[PDB]
């Protein structure tokens, strides 16, 4: 097989993703969505983790759900789905403590803050999490590549 859904990955591990994987899926998915916007592809909200496809080479793409849409709404729905992958298997009354830069990323993506407006803004914030910003493409590809290979061993 060449791709696993984020949903499959969560089920196989029966535990949430780690923080680095959240940063990486976010960066990588936004990279693909940005390439698709260049070709005026139809925009789809991320309804569940099933739509997020992690590939053997570490690319991450967004499939349409089996069933107008602003760029910000795709981002918002991705932010929500990523948060649920970090929260996977927790009781409704418990809450994972995220590092502050990652909480901030999610808060801004989901518009729950008490300012991100494109795929490119999300990528900039993900790149800034690394000590050396220019390592982002190779590092985040490597994280998702490892996430795939490891899940395939189980």
């Amino acid at each position: 097989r060449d791709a696993l859904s984020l949903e499959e990955i969560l089920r196989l591990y029966n535990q949430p993703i780690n923080e680095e994987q959240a940063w990486a899926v976010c960066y990588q998915c936004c990279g693909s969505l940005r390439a698709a916007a260049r070709r005026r592809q139809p925009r789809h909200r991320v309804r569940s983790a099933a739509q997020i496809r992690v590939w053997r080479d570490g690319a991450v793409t967004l499939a349409p759900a089996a069933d107008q849409c602003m760029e910000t709404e795709v981002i918002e729905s991705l932010g929500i789905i990523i948060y649920k992958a970090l929260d996977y298997g927790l009781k409704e009354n418990e809450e994972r403590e995220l590092s502050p830069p990652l909480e901030q990323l999610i808060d801004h993506m989901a518009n729950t803050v008490e300012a991100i407006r494109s795929y490119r803004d999300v990528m900039k914030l993900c790149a800034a999490h690394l000590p050396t910003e220019s390592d982002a493409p190779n590092h985040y590809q490597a994280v998702c590549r490892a996430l795939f290979a490891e899940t395939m061993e189980l």
Partner: peptide, 19 residues
């Protein structure tokens, strides 16, 4: 990772209200 009791109007709570 650290687990703590759900925070009133923290991130988990704000996100539960969007869905």
């Amino acid at each position: 990772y650290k687990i703590k009791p759900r925070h009133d109007s923290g991130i988990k709570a704000k996100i539960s209200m969007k869905t």
